[PDB]
Swiss-Prot record, chain A:
Location, primary (coarse class): cytoplasm
Example of a GO MF term: ATP binding
Listed name of the protein: Proline--tRNA ligase
EC number: 6.1.1.15
Organism in which the protein naturally occurs: Pseudomonas aeruginosa (strain ATCC 15692 / DSM 22644 / CIP 104116 / JCM 14847 / LMG 12228 / 1C / PRS 101 / PAO1)
PANTHER family xrefs: MITOCHONDRIAL RIBOSOME PROTEIN L39/PROLYL-TRNA LIGASE FAMILY MEMBER, PROLINE--TRNA LIGASE
Record Gene3D superfamilies: Anticodon-binding domain, Bira Bifunctional Protein, Domain 2, YbaK/aminoacyl-tRNA synthetase-associated domain
TM region positions: none
Domain of life of the native organism: Bacteria
Gene, per the UniProt record: proS
Lineage of the organism: Bacteria, Pseudomonadati, Pseudomonadota, Gammaproteobacteria, Pseudomonadales
UniProtKB/Swiss-Prot annotation, chain B:
Gene Ontology BP annotations: prolyl-tRNA aminoacylation
Reaction(s) this enzyme catalyzes, per UniProt: tRNA(Pro) + L-proline + ATP = L-prolyl-tRNA(Pro) + AMP + diphosphate
Protein name: Proline--tRNA ligase
Subunit structure: Homodimer.
Similarity remark: Belongs to the class-II aminoacyl-tRNA synthetase family. ProS type 1 subfamily.
Cellular location(s): Cytoplasm
Note on domains (UniProt): Consists of three domains: the N-terminal catalytic domain, the editing domain and the C-terminal anticodon-binding domain.
Keywords (A to Z) from UniProt: Aminoacyl-tRNA synthetase, ATP-binding, Cytoplasm, Ligase, Nucleotide-binding, Protein biosynthesis
GO CC term (a single one): cytosol
Length: 572, 568
């Protein structure tokens, strides 16, 4: 019973290299860890499954230590539950819907809030049972429009999803903080450089959601940190405050200027030799009040934050931009020619805009701008709000330090749900005093298969994968030279048995001479095995084995009599 | 602490079999919809214990664990032909791009696709891949709780070989691994021969948990190793010779005589002197074949289909087809003046002076004798065995038992590799279509099967390997500080020594009687009761799940005592 390369290192051919463009995808294919079945659907090959199980074990251990109870819920779920929550329609096209042979309707679960709520309303009948936290490690399906980046944006993927139930907000906060702490322990034990960040929870301010990110150059998410405080937020959530302390004095009188073929900030800047920080962008969106429009204004060098925009009560959520036809009907001028002066719709300006002076804006007259605009003198200041994305070097909104923007891969997300589900689905328990209480809920998700890829995105070199110690699929590769020779065979097999008996996970390279030593060595490093031992006649003659670490440049001789001492020391 | 206030969800017209009843009542599972169940905390613990044992034995047999997707592209199923052929149990769907998929009921096509990409050298063979993975089968009437669900957990393995001998070695290894699995799960089980789709041969076996509720009949020789499911079990006659003709054949009017019972009762004939004639579709398009068994016997539809002359799968001729071919209807058929091909059962060949429908409506021949009145047709084994029949290997007699199928193994030949073009060059450079086996265990079914076999009036009896916890701590008044500290200490010591402990932490509103009944329902094999009185006398109160009476252990020797009980 040896684990052998002839079995574990399968063919990686009929893989078009154009098809893998991020390093984790390339290396998971080349290392024989995953194989594509179809768009966003991958098999875990024997080597890759070993890594997945190590992630799952650590996640389960830390969920258990935090007092959560493991369950396992079905993938296929009745549409009727999804209609109770409203997500049957609202979830959108990522929900995979189907019908069974009796014409009954179902989805494949992308997540399990409705199922666990249905469970709770049947299983939780007393306050003495609360608080409680249920979790599973289970395969989800989300019909991502363009599955890509290997495991990072698959359609079928493994999630640890937990759901907690409470009679009060304070109770929820306690579990939520416990889940945050458990996540920190998980990503620490997985040997990943990671950060928790504040995330959007569907309103201005507050702290009802956090994300956990693996730091990596390829990460799709912008995450924001103070260089001096513990402030940390994804860019959707990060609060923007102005660099300026006050509004500058007006130095220019307002004038109406002809600006043909001037429909972008760049054209205005280049065309009229304006600093970009003296220009504004006026974006028109649908109002929450049906049939109304709202103008949202940011400085010309800033971007509208669509989450912040939507979260304004006056602005419809989700965010909908006005069409050119709607804008022209409302204002009598088109995109490129809009601004706050003589604007016949409501307006909200960014904090930085409120402090601008002598600024340029579309005149709400086609192909004209006002220059030298000043608040109060030329028009009243409208409502002010935080509307923009932060940018590198902005002030930290807690007043401590300046902001830096890094890239992250989202591997965890936790949420406070209040009574969103318990109200919709009638989940209530009587308090100790005998009052009906709609249960207050949290939910907590880790992208378990994503974590595997994220680890590689963060940890790789020119020779292939670098695993954190907790993730390596094997600890030791034995590379016998001439394993067919009786002396090498028996010494190699003896070494395998001694190491395995000490609890080490060992892979034996049993491949014949058509695989050169050089290829074998490169294979073991590509897969990311942290240690190798080479066995040869020459070494045995001198009573040595040849050792090399994955992160060592040179091999070293290992006296056979110090095997366990030497190797135990390396694996600590 | 693992505590009852969290775990215990112990508390139904749809629940008719005992395992289903008890899994609900013990808070192990909860129904979401038809054939869809959630594993509750206590139940999941049992499932994981099954999975661990299965994984251990698969790994020891040299199989490599993988994990394949549930959603599978239709194109692979079209290659094998099972996109259509699997039938309505295949759950078919379309994604947002209108591409077609199924949810996997099994994974032959996916693993074959993997193999044609991953296996390119004879040096890689033989190889055996397996997964423990949730399947979906759209069972027309999901029932029996976990036994016939729609979503269920299967361990499925698939082996690849360059020769039949190589397959046989792995197949035998899987058979042996299965034996170890069900032995370690503490189940009383038997392996049996199963249908392979031809007469004779040994390319399929099933593993059954013996249980009174078992849907499957399985057959054993009392004196030999012979073991087969009823589909597969070979039938041989009890008689050694055909009797001499003592009666002349004669045509008899027999109105309202369309069953064996009407003929036996109506005309006072022994049932062993009557025959049933069943008309089925021939393999040759548009033809019919008559299959004949003795009146006390039943046609085995697997044996019938496996006859080369008979279309497979088996299709029975309609009344209209029968009337058109023969000129009489069901109830009036037989082998005399029969204008279609006929095959008779081994037992029928030995009959004499027998009665048969005349192939004339409402008439029978009596006094029929082979050779004299008509030629003997082809003879075959067509009937089901019955209790007390001769063992077909000549050694002993057969007994029939009821089984729950929990495992099934198959030799597939090149069925998939030919259709999907899976081939590897031999050492000689000749392309070889890979010869395949597959091996399945119904992991979630096993949990229910265990209870079907092992239960009593107080609830579940788990095999030691399956029990969700080893010890229940039942403090009588846990609010009492002396009790709380002693119990908590006990929990810590026990847990520290590696034992799995449930602490009943529930308040006074739950009587000690209910606590005891709950721990027995859920099947925990050992309890320790902690009372202040007991602690004052330096004694704890122990009881095994299968014991009649509790006993008083000295508070000091509990650890040695418990350790011994759990060291077997
Ligand atoms: N395509 C994809 N491929 C691979 N891994 C993916 C992982 C996620 C993922 C992971 C963690 C949390 C979330 S979430 O933020 O959506 N939150 C919830 O689902 C909540 C918490 C748990 C109960 N419901 C999504 C999403 C994807 F799309 C993936
Ligand atoms: N409804 C149901 N509920 C719960 N458990 C069920 C279990 C099975 C089951 C178990 C073992 C083998 C088989 S099989 O004989 O079909 N063989 C194959 O699938 C082969 C071997 C493995 C690769 N393919 C079916 C079938 C069901 F329908 C179930």
């Amino acid at each position: 019973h040896h684990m052998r390369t002839s079995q574990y290192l399968l063919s990686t051919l009929k893989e078009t290299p154009a098809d893998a463009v991020v390093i984790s995808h390339q290396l998971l294919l080349r290392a024989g860890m995953i194989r594509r079945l179809a768009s966003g659907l991958y098999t875990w090959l024997p080597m890759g499954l070993r890594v997945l199980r190590k992630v799952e074990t650590i996640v389960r251990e830390e969920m258990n230590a935090a007092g959560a109870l493991e369950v396992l819920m079905p993938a296929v779920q009745p549409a009727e539950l999804w209609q109770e929550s409203g997500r049957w329609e609202q979830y959108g096209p990522e929900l995979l819907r189907l019908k069974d042979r009796h014409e009954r309707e179902f989805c494949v679960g992308p997540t399990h809030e409705e199922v666990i709520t249905d469970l709770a309303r049947n299983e939780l009948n007393s306050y003495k049972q609360l608080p409680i936290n249920f979790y599973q490690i289970q395969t989800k399906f989300r019909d991502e429009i363009r599955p890509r980046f290997g495991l990072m944006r698959g359609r079928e993927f493994i999630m640890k999803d937990a759901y907690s139930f409470h009679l009060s907000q304070d109770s929820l906060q306690q579990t939520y903080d416990g889940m945050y702490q458990a996540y920190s322990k998980i990503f620490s034990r997985l040997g990943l450089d990671f950060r928790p960040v504040q995330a959007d929870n569907g309103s201005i301010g507050g702290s009802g959601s956090h994300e956990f990110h693996v730091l990596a150059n390829s990460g799709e998410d912008d995450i924001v940190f103070s260089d001096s405080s513990d402030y940390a937020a994804n860019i959707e959530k990060a609060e923007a405050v102005p660099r300026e302390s006050a509004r500058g004095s007006a130095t220019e009188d307002m004038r109406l200027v002809d600006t043909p073929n001037t429909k972008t900030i760049a054209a205005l800047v280049d065309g009229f030799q304006l600093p970009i920080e003296k220009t504004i962008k006026t974006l028109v969106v649908h109002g929450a009040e049906e049939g109304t429009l709202v103008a949202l204004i940011v400085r010309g060098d800033h971007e509208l934050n669509e989450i912040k925009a939507a979260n304004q009560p006056l602005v419809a959520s989700p965010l909908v931009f006005a069409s050119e036809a709607e804008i022209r009907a409302a204002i009598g001028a088109g995109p490129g020619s809009l601004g706050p002066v003589n604007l016949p719709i409501a307006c909200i300006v960014d904090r930085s805009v409120a402090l601008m002076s002598d600024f340029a804006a579309g005149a709400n007259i086609e192909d004209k701008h006002y220059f030298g605009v000043n608040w109060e003198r030329d028009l009243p200041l409208p409502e002010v709000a935080d509307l923009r994305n932060v940018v590198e070097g902005d002030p930290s909104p807690d007043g401590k330090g300046t902001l830096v923007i890094k890239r992250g891969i989202e591997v965890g997300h936790i949420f406070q749900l209040g009574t969103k589900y318990s109200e919709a689905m009638k989940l209530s328990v009587l308090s100790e005093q005998g009052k009906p209480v709609n249960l207050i809920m949290g939910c907590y998700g880790i992208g378990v298969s994503r974590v595997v890829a994220a680890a590689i995105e963060q940890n790789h070199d020119e020779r292939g994968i670098l695993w954190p110690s907790a993730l390596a699929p094997f600890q030791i590769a034995l590379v016998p030279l001439k394993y067919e020779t009786e002396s090498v065979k028996q010494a190699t097999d003896k070494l395998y048995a001694e190491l395995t008996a000490a609890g080490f996970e060992v892979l034996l390279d049993d491949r014949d001479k058509k695989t050169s030593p050089g290829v074998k060595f490169a294979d073991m490093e590509l897969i990311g095995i942290p240690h190798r031992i080479v066995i040869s006649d020459r070494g045995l003659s001198e009573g040595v084995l040849e050792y090399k670490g994955r992160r060592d440049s040179e091999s070293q001789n290992l006296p056979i009599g110090e095997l366990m001492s030497f190797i135990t020391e390396k694996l600590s």
